[PDB]
Amino acid sequence: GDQRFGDLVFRQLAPNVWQHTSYLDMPGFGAVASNGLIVRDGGRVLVVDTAWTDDQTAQILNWIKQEINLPVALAVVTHAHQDKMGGMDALHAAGIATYANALSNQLAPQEGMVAAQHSLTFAANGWVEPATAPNFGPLKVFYPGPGHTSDNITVGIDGTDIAFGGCLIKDSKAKSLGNLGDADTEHYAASARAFGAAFPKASMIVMSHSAPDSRAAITHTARMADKLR
Ligand SMILES: C[C@H](CS)C(=O)N1CCc2ccccc2[C@@H]1C(=O)O
Ligand SMILES: [Zn+2]
Ligand SMILES: [Zn+2]
Q: Where are the domains of the chain?
A: 2-227
208 alpha carbon – ligand 1 mean position (Å): 10
- Contact in structure between 78 and 154 (CB atoms under 8 Å): yes
Which architecture does CATH list for 2-227?
A: 4-Layer Sandwich (3.60)
- Structure resolution, Å: 1.2
118 is in an annotated binding site: no
161 is in an annotated binding site: no
79 alpha carbon – ligand 2 mean position (Å): 7
d(CA 98, CA 49): 10
d(CA 174, CA 216): 11
- Contact in structure between 34 and 22 (CB atoms under 8 Å): yes
DSSP letter (8 states) at residue 170: -
Sequence letter at residue 113: M
Q: Which residues line ligand 1 (CB under 6 A)?
A: 26, 29, 32, 81-83, 167, 178-179, 209
227 is in an annotated binding site: no
124 alpha carbon – ligand 3 mean position (Å): 25
d(CA 41, CA 137): 7
Report in angstroms the alpha-carbon separations of 26 from 30, 31, 165, 221: 6, 6, 22, 23
- Contact in structure between 54 and 90 (CB atoms under 8 Å): yes
Residue 29 CA to its chain's centroid (Å) = 21
